[PDB]
Structure formats: structure tokens, C-alpha cells
Amino acid sequence: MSEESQAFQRQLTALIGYDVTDVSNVHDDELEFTRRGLVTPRMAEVASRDPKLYAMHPWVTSKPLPEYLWKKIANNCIFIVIHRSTTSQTIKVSPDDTPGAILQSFFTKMQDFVLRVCGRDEYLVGETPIKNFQWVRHCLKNGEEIHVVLDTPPDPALDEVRKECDRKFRVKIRGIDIPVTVFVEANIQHGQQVLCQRRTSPKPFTEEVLWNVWLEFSIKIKDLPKGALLNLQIYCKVRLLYYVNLLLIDHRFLLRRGEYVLHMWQISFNADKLTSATNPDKENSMSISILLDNRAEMPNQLRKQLEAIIATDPLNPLTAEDKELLWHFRYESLKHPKAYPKLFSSVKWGQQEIVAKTYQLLARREVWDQSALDVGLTMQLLDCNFSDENVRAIAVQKLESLEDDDVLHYLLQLVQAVKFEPYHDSALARFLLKRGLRNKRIGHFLFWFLRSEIAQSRHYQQRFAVILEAYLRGCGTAMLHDFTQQVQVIEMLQKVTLDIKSLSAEKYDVSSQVISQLKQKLENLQNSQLPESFRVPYDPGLKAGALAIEKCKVMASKKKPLWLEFKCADPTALSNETIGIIFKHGDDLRQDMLILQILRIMESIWETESLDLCLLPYGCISTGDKIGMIEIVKDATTIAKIQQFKDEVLNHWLKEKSPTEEKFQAAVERFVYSCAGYCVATFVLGIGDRHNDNIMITETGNLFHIDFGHIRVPFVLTPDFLFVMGTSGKKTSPHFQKFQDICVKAYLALRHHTNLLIILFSMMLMTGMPQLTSKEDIEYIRDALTVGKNEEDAKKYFLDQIEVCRDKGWTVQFNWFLH
Ligand SMILES: COc1ccc2c(c1)c(/C=C1\Oc3cc(O)cc(O)c3C1=O)c1n2CCNC1
Numbered sequence: 001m002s003e004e005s006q007a008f009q010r011q012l013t014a015l016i017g018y019d020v021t022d023v024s025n026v027h028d029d030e031l032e033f034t035r036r037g038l039v040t041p042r043m044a045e046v047a048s049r050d051p052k053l054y055a056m057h058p059w060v061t062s063k064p065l066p067e068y069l070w071k072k073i074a075n076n077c078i079f080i081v082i083h084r085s086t087t088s089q090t091i092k093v094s095p096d097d098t099p100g101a102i103l104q105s106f107f108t109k110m111q112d113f114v115l116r117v118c119g120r121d122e123y124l125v126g127e128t129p130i131k132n133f134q135w136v137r138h139c140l141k142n143g144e145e146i147h148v149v150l151d152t153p154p155d156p157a158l159d160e161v162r163k164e165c166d167r168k169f170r171v172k173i174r175g176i177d178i179p180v181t182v183f184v185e186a187n188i189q190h191g192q193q194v195l196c197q198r199r200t201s202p203k204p205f206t207e208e209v210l211w212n213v214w215l216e217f218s219i220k221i222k223d224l225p226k227g228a229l230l231n232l233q234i235y236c237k238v239r240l241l242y243y244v245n246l247l248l249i250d251h252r253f254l255l256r257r258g259e260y261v262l263h264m265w266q267i268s269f270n271a272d273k274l275t276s277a278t279n280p281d282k283e284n285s286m287s288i289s290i291l292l293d294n295r296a297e298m299p300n301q302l303r304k305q306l307e308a309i310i311a312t313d314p315l316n317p318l319t320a321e322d323k324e325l326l327w328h329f330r331y332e333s334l335k336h337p338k339a340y341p342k343l344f345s346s347v348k349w350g351q352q353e354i355v356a357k358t359y360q361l362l363a364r365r366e367v368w369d370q371s372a373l374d375v376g377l378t379m380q381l382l383d384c385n386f387s388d389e390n391v392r393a394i395a396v397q398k399l400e401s402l403e404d405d406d407v408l409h410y411l412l413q414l415v416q417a418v419k420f421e422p423y424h425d426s427a428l429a430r431f432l433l434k435r436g437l438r439n440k441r442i443g444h445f446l447f448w449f450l451r452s453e454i455a456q457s458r459h460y461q462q463r464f465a466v467i468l469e470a471y472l473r474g475c476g477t478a479m480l481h482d483f484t485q486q487v488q489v490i491e492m493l494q495k496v497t498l499d500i501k502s503l504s505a506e507k508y509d510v511s512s513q514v515i516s517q518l519k520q521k522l523e524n525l526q527n528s529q530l531p532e533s534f535r536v537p538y539d540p541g542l543k544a545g546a547l548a549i550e551k552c553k554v555m556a557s558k559k560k561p562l563w564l565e566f567k568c569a570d571p572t573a574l575s576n577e578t579i580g581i582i583f584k585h586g587d588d589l590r591q592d593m594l595i596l597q598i599l600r601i602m603e604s605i606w607e608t609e610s611l612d613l614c615l616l617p618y619g620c621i622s623t624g625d626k627i628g629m630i631e632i633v634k635d636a637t638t639i640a641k642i643q644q645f646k647d648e649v650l651n652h653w654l655k656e657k658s659p660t661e662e663k664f665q666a667a668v669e670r671f672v673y674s675c676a677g678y679c680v681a682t683f684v685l686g687i688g689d690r691h692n693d694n695i696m697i698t699e700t701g702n703l704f705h706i707d708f709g710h711i712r713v714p715f716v717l718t719p720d721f722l723f724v725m726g727t728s729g730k731k732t733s734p735h736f737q738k739f740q741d742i743c744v745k746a747y748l749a750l751r752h753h754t755n756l757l758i759i760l761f762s763m764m765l766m767t768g769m770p771q772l773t774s775k776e777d778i779e780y781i782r783d784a785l786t787v788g789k790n791e792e793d794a795k796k797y798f799l800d801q802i803e804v805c806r807d808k809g810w811t812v813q814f815n816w817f818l819h
Contacts, residue, residue, distance in 0.1 A: 008162070012472055015483050017455050018465040025280040027260060030251040031466055034424040038470040041430045045437040046474045051156035055478075056114070056123035057440035059134040061405040065095070067610035072140045078130070080146045082106060083118065083572070095131035099124055118147035119573040120541040134405070141612075149572045159476035165221040167294065169248075173200055174289035175210035176234060176242075184288075186215055187231040188224075188248070189274070191387030195219060195228070195350040205236065221255065221294055224248055225349045227387040227422035229274065232262065232288055242266050242286050247276050251423050255294060262288045265459070269772040270765070271419040274384065275459045298332055306332065310339040313787050314380055314758050315778060318342060330361055337371040341380040344391050355388075362390055373401050375410065376756030382417045382428065383763060389426070396427035404439045409604060411442060412597045413760060415449045416767040424463050433467065437474050444540045446471060447483060448621050452590060456625040485534045490623050492529055493564065496521050497583040497627065501560040510556045518562075522549050533569035536579060538619025538631050544579045545569025551578065559586040563632070580632030587709050589628035592620045594768045595685065595708040598760055602681050602750065609749045613677025613742070614670055616704035633698060639720065640693040645810055647723040654724065657699035667701035668724055672735055674703040676742035679715050683801065684750060685761065686780050688715030691816045713812045717805035729806065740802060744795045751794065754785050 013019050020035065078093045080102065089110070093102050099115055115124045122135050130136050139146050173184050182205035188195045196217040203209050226249045234242040242264035250256055263279040264286045265272070279285040298306075306329060309322050318326075323346035326333055333339045348354045381395035399414075407414075414432060421428055436443040450468040454461045472480065500518055504511070526547055533545040544566035551565040561584035568579060599617035606613055619631035635657075643649055654671075658664035682688045682705065689712050690705065697703045719729065726733035750757060761781045765773040786794045 011480070011484070012469055015472060015480070015487060016465055016468050017451060017487075018461055020462075020465050020469050025278065025462070027262075027278070028250060030276075030424055031462055033251055034466050035469070037425045038430065038433060038466075041434055042437070042470055042474045045434050046161055049438055051159060052153065053126065054438075054440065055154045055156050055159050056125050058123055058126045058128070059405075059441060060126060060128050060132055060403075061134060061137070062128075062132065062403055063405070063607075065131050065137070066607055066612065068612050069137065069140050072143065073131075078136075078146070080130075080148055082115070083147065083149045084151075093130065096129045098128070099126060099130065102130065112153065113150055114153045115148045115150055117541075118149050119568060119570055119575075121535075121543060121570075122541045124148060147574050158478040160478075161474055161476060165294070167221055168216050169196075169219050169221055169224060169294055170214050170216040171230065172214050172291040172293075173211050173232075174291065175208065175212070176286060176288050177208050178286040179207070179284060181205055181236065182209060183235055184211070185233045185235060187229075187233070188217060188219060189229045189231045189245075190225055190227065190349045192274075192384045193349065219350060220352075222352050223350050224255070225355060225388070226253070227389065228349075229276070229422070232264075232290070234264070234286070234288075240267055242288075243273055244278060244288060245274060245276055247422065251425070257292050257294060260290050260292070262290070264288060267771065269774065270770060271384070271416075271767045272457075272459045272770070274420070274422075276422070277459055277462055280458060295331065298329065302329075303332070309342065310336055313782060314341060314755055315762070315782055318346060322346070330357075334361060334365070335367060337368055337374065338377060340368070340377070340394075341385075344381070344388070345385055349388070358388075359390060362394060365394070368394060369397075371398075373398050375399075375402070375406070376753060376759055379410075379413070379417070379756070379759040379763070382414075382420060383759070384420050384766060386420075387422045389423075392421070393427040396431050399431060404435070404442060407435050407439070407442055408445065409601060411445055412449055412593060413763055415446070415453075416763065418463065418467070419460055419767050424466060429467055429470075433470050436471050440479070441540060443471060443475050443479065444537075447475075448537055452593070452622045456590070456622070482535050485531045486537050488529070488531065489534045490537070490629065492525050493562070493581075493583050494585075494623060494627060496525075497560070497562050497585050500554060500562070501585055504560065506558060508560075510554060514554055518554050519549055519552065522547055522552060536581075536619075537621050537629065542579060543569045548578050555582070559584070561585070565632075577634065580634075582630040582632055583627075584630065585627040587707065588626055589620055589622040589630070591710070591768050592628075592630075592708050593622055594764045595687070596620050598685065598757075598764070599681060601756075601760065602677075605753055605756075606677075606746060606749055609752075611742075611746055611749060612673065613680070613746055614673045614702060615677045615681065616674065616698075616702055618704070618706075633696065633704065635699040636696045636702075636704075637699075638693060639695050639697065640691070642697075643692070643720075645814070647719050647728075650720045650724050654699075654701060663700075667699075668735065670701035671697070671703060671721075671724060672739055673742060674701070675717075675721060676739060676746060678703055678705055679717060679802075680743055680747045680750065683715050683747075683798075684757065684781060684784055686784060687711040689713050689812065690716050692716075692718070692813050712815075713805050713808050714801040715805060717802065718813060719806070719809045722806065729809070740799060743802065744798060747798050748791055748795065751785055751791070754787060757781065757785065 009021065073095055076094055078095060080091050080093055082089055082091065091102060091106060103113065103115060116122070117124060117135055124130065124133055124135065136146055171186055173186065176184065181202045183202045184200045185197065187197045196219050198215040198217060200211050200213055200215070203211070228248045230246045230248050232244050232246070233240055244262045244264040246256065246260065246262065248256055263282055265279050266286065306325060309326065326343050326346040330343065333343050344358070347358050378395045378398045382392055386392055414428065418428055432446060436446040447468065450464045454464045454468060496518070500514060503514055503517065526549070530547065533543050536542040536544055546567045546569070548565040548567060553563040555561045555563055561582050564581045564583065565578035596617045599615055603615055616633060618633055620628065622628040642653055654667050655664055658667045687708060694707050695703065695705055695716060722728065725735040725739055727736045758781055762778050765778060786797050789797065
């Protein structure tokens with residue numbers, strides 16, 4: 001409409017945190033072009049969504065049930081408790097039973113009714129054995145009673161959506177211009193690969209430097225591959241100071257032609273360096289001007305050598321020899337899906353004819369389309385090393401086959417993977433969009449993962465923003481309402497975190513002018529702004545309402561984060577236990593998100609091989625620059641705050657918090673499990689050496705790391721843990737022979753997915769850890785995983801580690817103390 005369309009786009013702009021209608025920072029219509037283009041995908045998914053299963057969004061997995069979780073249910077029977085008003089009864093169910101089965105069973109024993117979960121916004125519905133729901137599978141993990149309130153199915157009317165040449169390519173470098181030696185290096189890149197490179201003559205380094213030079217390259221105009229970047233860089237002794245890119249071929253297949261004034265990025269190897277976006281800070285940024293006016297058999301020994309190349313890790317560099325060997329035998333390599341990354345990385349993309357052949361390869365592709373989806377393999381074809389629409393599209397095609405349970409597992413990295421797409425509209429984008437709209441849960445975390453970057457990343461906010469809007473216009477009017485509240489809450493509570501922080505610096509400790517000011521500001525919100533109830537952004541199912549002013553402190557840390565607690569705004573909550581958020585400024589929680597996400601993935605791995613290291617990957621979302629919220633683990637304490645250089649303290653503290661030897665032997669169990677998991681998970685990611693301050697433990701033995709900021713001893717295994725494990729400097733015990741038992745059993749489980757991990761660790765570095773990431777930085781996880789060696793001298797390798805941490809004891813922790 002007029003004002004009604006303006007109000008709708010005004011709302012969308014407020015939810016996004018960025019204006020997608022703004023054009024004061026483009027030089028084409030690709031961002032606009034994408035908006036119009038993504039409509040069809042949007043409308044198609046919206047059209048074909050089961051309104052009932054959508055509103056209720058059953059969180060389900062089609063995976064088996066772990067050995068350990070089969071034990072809890074030792075009778076092919078499961079106890080589910082149903083409530084109505086204040087009514088209550090207990091039903092015995094078969095693991096292979098159905099929501100409908102059990103429901104009808106209750107009615108006949110004692111329509112239009114559905115089983116909702118107690119305290120949450122979770123639904124136990126669908127044609128799935130209830131031994132396949134996540135909530136049910138969760139209770140069993142923590143040994144709990146599946147409480148379920150029975151009421152009416154929610155109205156889908158709420159999820160409603162509103163009505164809508166053969167010349168050598170040459171480029172002239174006019175000159176650079178900055179408000180307040182030097183030369184220019186104009187590369188033609190294609191997926192990290194450099195095809196041609198031309199520099200300008202060195203000149204004095206002043207605010208305005210002109211060359212008026214035509215830079216001819218070695219490449220024809222037809223040899224230019226779609227997705228090729230013109231990478232303009234600026235060097236001074238000598239160092240890279242400014243970079244900017246420009247897609248040689250545009251979003252509509254046209255060869256770019258004309259005059260360009262480009263504002264660059266300055267520095268201070270990663271994902272930010274291949275963006276088609278220009279610095280929007282015209283007032284301060286450097287500028288740059290340019291002109292565009294343009295079968296058979298195979299020998300035994302050779303097969304052997306080809307099969308050795310295809311076996312190596314994804315970080316193993318390809319020799320020229322290797323590459324030519326791959327490409328001469330492409331049809332024998334196509335037999336093997338695990339040879340695809342290396343195959344297309346051995347393609348000369350700077351040759352029209354070759355690329356032509358390559359597309360002839362992807363014609364079929366019979367074997368690829370028939371391979372059991374290898375996610376670790378699919379990720380490799382979506383990284384920086386690949387920029388061919390067709391290559392990346394066979395990876396996205398392979399993603400189309402996983403359940404929603406797995407999309408959630410990788411949503412974060414797939415979203416960050418968008419940073420590698422050359423164009424805005426892409427198989428990947430449209431996929432995150434298609435899958436988000438179809439599942440309420442995915443759409444939720446999608447929102448916050450995009451908003452995370454749209455708000456603190458100038459390099460990509462424009463692209464992500466066009467994608468977010470795409471999702472918002474088809475998520476539902478019920479989802480929109482929700483999001484608007486969540487945005488207001490963090491918008492308010494962030495004010496309070498920054499305002500409070502400026503009232504005190506290091507050495508501030510805490511004074512009661514703050515304990516008065518803080519508990520005075522939570523009023524303004526409570527009685528005016530703060531909504532009656534807002535959905536928790538790290539746990540969608542949990543609604544939180546009123547505040548708990550009394551229990552809201554201001555952490556006495558090196559900086560000032562908040563300790564907020566809320567009352568569950570849901571009446572039917574099984575018990576009482578506040579929801580605690582920690583609003584923090586000063587750290588980058590986008591690095592935390594990444595580690596926590598990989599932690600969840602290591603769980604799923606350990607799950608396939610029936611292990612349970614009971615990790616504690618708490619929720620953690622990044623809201624803005626250097627600011628975000630964390631989920632407060634209940635009944636947890638720091639080892640540091642536990643000793644405030646003694647060993648027995650841990651045991652005393654556990655026993656103190658554990659009434660009976662039974663509820664204490666579990667506290668040493670949960671401890672040994674959680675301890676092994678965190679010792680392995682950490683050693684692999686190279687974030688092993690921590691301080692006693694950055695490790696916590698619940699009153700029930702569960703150990704868990706925190707604050708993975710910018711993170712001598714392979715990992716924290718101090719004698720204080722050992723005392724709990726009944727061991728003292730060099731002596732051996734059962735719980736310690738059980739410790740080495742769990743560890744190696746888990747460490748090897750990960751080595752079975754070396755390829756997957758490596759690609760996530762790699763990508764994580766490029767999209768999450770700034771700035772320059774060496775090729776040597778990644779080389780770590782290889783050795784940390786011991787690529788190659790059998791499960792023999794590999795387990796031995798790891799068991800050497802466990803020993804170092806014992807023969808070091810407190811050494812490092814004490815050295816940490818020195819400041
Ligand atoms: C994570 O759940 C917690 C439970 C209790 C907690 C904390 C967290 C926490 C502090 C923190 O947690 C964090 C988790 C992160 O990913 C990143 C961070 O920068 C932090 C952090 O600064 C403190 N306490 C007890 C009272 N002093 C401090």
C-alpha cells in the first residue's frame with residue numbers, strides 16, 4: 001500500500017537492524033535484484049507448508065536411540081504424566097508408540113486435543129515414535145518425568161502471511177585518494193586462486209596519487225570465469241593496507257563495463273577479504289578509481305597413486321603433478337565422491353575450454369547423486385576454495401536430504417558459509433531460506449544468526465540483510481510479533497549494560513551506588529517498557545516474563561556484565577526456577593557461538609557411537625559488536641571461587657552439595673564423564689590451556705568450560721580433579737583407569753570424522769577469528785588429531801598428554817596468577 005506498505009517495511013527495517021532499501025553504498029542493482037529474485041523461493045515454501053505441523057513445529061529426529069539411553073527405559077515402557085486444570089494421571093507407554101496412539105489410549109481409558117509440554121512451548125505431536133522426540137529424549141538423558149499439559153491445538157490463522165572478444169582484459173588505474181612508498185596490485189582472483197597479477201609503478205605516497213595506467217593482463221575476455229573477482233589491493237614496507245573487490249562478471253551474466261570509484265577496507269587469509277561490498281564510510285575511507293572498457297583402462301601403479309591422493313586429508317596440498325593426474329583421469333575420479341574437492345580444485349578455471357569440460361563432468365554425476373550424504377564432504381565444496389556456481393550447487397543439492405534435526409546442527413556454519421558465495425542470490429542462500437520458513441525452530445535461530453552479523457559486520461551486512469528480510473516476509477505474523485519483542489528486550493537491557501559499565505573501570509570491584517543505580521534502572525523497564533513476556537533467544541521454547549530485581553546483581557569481574565533472572569511467563573511450569581541471562585560487553589561472543597556449536601556437533605558424533613561425555617554447550621547469542629547474552633547454568637560455581645592451591649577442596653565441596661553417597665557417586669560420575677569430554681573436545685580445538693577461573697562445575701558434578709575469548713599444558717587436568725578421581729601424583733586408581741578409558745574411547749570417535757572436524761575448524765577460523773589466519777594456524781588440528789597413525793600410536797600419543805598435565809600439576813595455574 002502507501003502508508004500501510006511503508007509501515008510494514010518500517011517494521012521489517014527495525015527487526016533487521018539495517019535498511020535494505022538504502023542505496024547510498026552500491027554501484028549496481030544486485031542487492032535489489034536479489035530481493036525480487038528470492039520471492040519465488042519464498043512463496044513456494046510458504047505455499048507448501050502444513051499449517052498444523054508448522055505452528056506446533058515438532059522437534060524430531062529419525063536417528064536411533066543410544067545404547068545408554070535404552071538402559072533408562074528397561075521395560076519397553078515409558079512414564080508420561082498428563083495434566084488438565086490441576087488433574088494428573090500416569091500412563092505407561094511403548095517407546096514405539098505415537099502421540100496419537102497414547103492420546104487416544106488416554107481418552108478410551110478415561111477430540112481435537114494435543115499434548116503440549118509442561119513449562120515450555122514444545123509440542124509432542126506427529127507420526128513419530130515418542131522415542132524419537134528431542135524433549136522426550138532429553139528427559140531420559142537427565143532422568144526426568146515427561147510432564148505434559150493437555151489442551152487445544154494452536155490456531156494456524158496466527159502463522160498467516162501478509163499479501164506480498166579476444167583481447168587481453170585490461171583495467172586502467174586512475175589513482176588512489178584518501179582524506180587523511182605506494183603501489184596498486186590488481187589481481188584476477190577465482191575462489192582464493194590467483195589467475196593474473198599486475199602492479200603499477202611505485203610512486204611517492206601522498207593523499208592523492210594518479211597513474212592513468214592501462215593494466216593489461218594475460219587473460220582473454222572469454223577465459224574469464226563467472227564469479228571472478230577483480231581484487232584491487234594497495235601496498236606500502238612492504239605490507240597490505242587496503243583491499244576492495246569487484247565482480248568482473250555481474251549477476252546477470254554481463255561483463256562489467258564503466259567508471260568505478262571504490263572505497264576500500266583497511267587492515268590491522270580470512271573471509272572478509274573476498275567481499276563484493278565497499279566501505280560505506282565515505283567520509284574517512286581510502287578511495288580508488290578505475291576504468292572498464294572491455295573409454296579406456298588405467299595402469300595398476302597409476303590407479304594406486306590416484307587412490308593415495310584421494311585418501312589424504314582436506315588440508316593436504318595438491319602438487320602440480322597431482323592436479324594434472326586428477327584432471328587427466330576425471331572420469332575415474334568421478335567414481336569417487338570423496339575425490340570431488342581435489343578434482344575441482346585441480347581445474348584450470350582460467351580457460352573457457354577446460355571449464356566447458358568440467359560442466360560436461362557434472363552432467364552426471366550419476367554416482368554423486370547416489371552417494372550417502374557426507375556432510376564433512378559437502379562443506380568442503382562450500383568454502384573459500386570454490387567459487388563456481390555449479391560446483392557449489394551440487395553441495396547444496398546434497399544438503400537437501402537431511403532432516404531438520406541436522407540443519408540445526410550446522411545452521412551456524414552454513415550461514416557463515418554464505419560469506420564465501422560470490423553472488424548474493426545463491427543455492428545456499430535460497431536453501432537457508434527454504435528450510436527456515438518450513439521449520440519454526442530453524443527460522444528462529446536463522447533470524448539471530450543473520451542479525452548477529454548484520455549488526456557488527458560492515459563487510460556483509462548488506463547481503464545477510466537481504467536474506468533476513470527474505471525470511472521475515474514469510475515466517476508468519478505470529479513470528480514477527482515474537483521477534484519484535486525479543487529485539488526490544490535486548491535493545492533495552494543492552495543500554496543498561498553499557499550505561500552501568502561506564503560508571504566503573506578495572507579496580508572498580510563493586511560499590512553500592514551501582515547496586516542502587518542498576519536496581520533502579522530495571523524499574524524503568526519493569527514498569528514501562530519491558531513486555532509482559534518475551535521469548536528467550538537461545539531457547540525458543542522458553543518464554544520469560546517478569547524480572548526478578550532482587551536476584552539481579554552486577555558481576556564483579558574485570559568488566560561489567562549483568563546477572564539477570566526472570567520468572568517463566570508460563571503458568572503451567574512444572575516447578576519454579578528463574579531463567580538467567582548474562583548480558584556482557586567487552587568480549588566477542590561470535591567466537592563463543594562458534595565453539596559452542598562445534599561442541600554440540602561433537603556430541604552428535606559421540607552419540608552415533610553410543611558415548612555420553614555429558615558436555616554442557618550452554619546457549620550464547622551475539623547481539624551486537626562486543627556484546628551479547630549468555631545462558632546461566634544453574635547451580636554452577638567456578639573452581640577459582642571454590643579455592644577462594646589445595647587438592648581436597650573439590651571433594652569436600654562436592655560431598656557438601658551431595659546429600660547421600662548415592663547422589664555423590666553420581667557427582668563423581670558426571671564429573672569423570674564431563675571431564676573427559678571437555679579434555680578431549682578442548683585438546684582438538686587447541687583451546688586446552690585455560691585458567692582455573694574459566695572452568696566451572698555444577699553441584700551435581702558436571703564440569704564445563706566458559707568464555708572462549710581469544711583462547712605449556714595440553715589441557716586443564718589439575719591434581720584437584722585427580723583427588724576426586726582417587727589419585728595422587730603418579731598413583732593409579734579405578735576412576736582414573738576409567739578416565740583414560742572414556743577419553744581414548746571418545747578421542748578416537750572424533751578421528752573417525754577427521755575430515756568433518758577439519759573443515760569446521762578451518763571455516764571457523766576464516767569467518768570467526770580475525771584477522772589474518774595463517775595456513776599454519778589450521779595445520780594444528782591435523783597434528784592434534786594425528787592424521788594417519790593407526791588407532792595404536794595415536795591413542796598412545798594422546799595418553800602421553802594426560803601424563804604431562806599430571807607431571808605439571810599446578811605449575812601453569814600458579815604462573816597464571818603472576819600478573
Ligand atoms: C555460563 O553460565 C554461567 C554460570 C555461572 C557463571 C557464569 C556463567 C559466569 C561468567 C561468564 O560465563 C561466560 C560464558 C561465556 O561463554 C563467555 C563469558 O564471557 C562468560 C562469563 O563472563 C560467572 N558465573 C558465576 C559468577 N561469576 C561469573
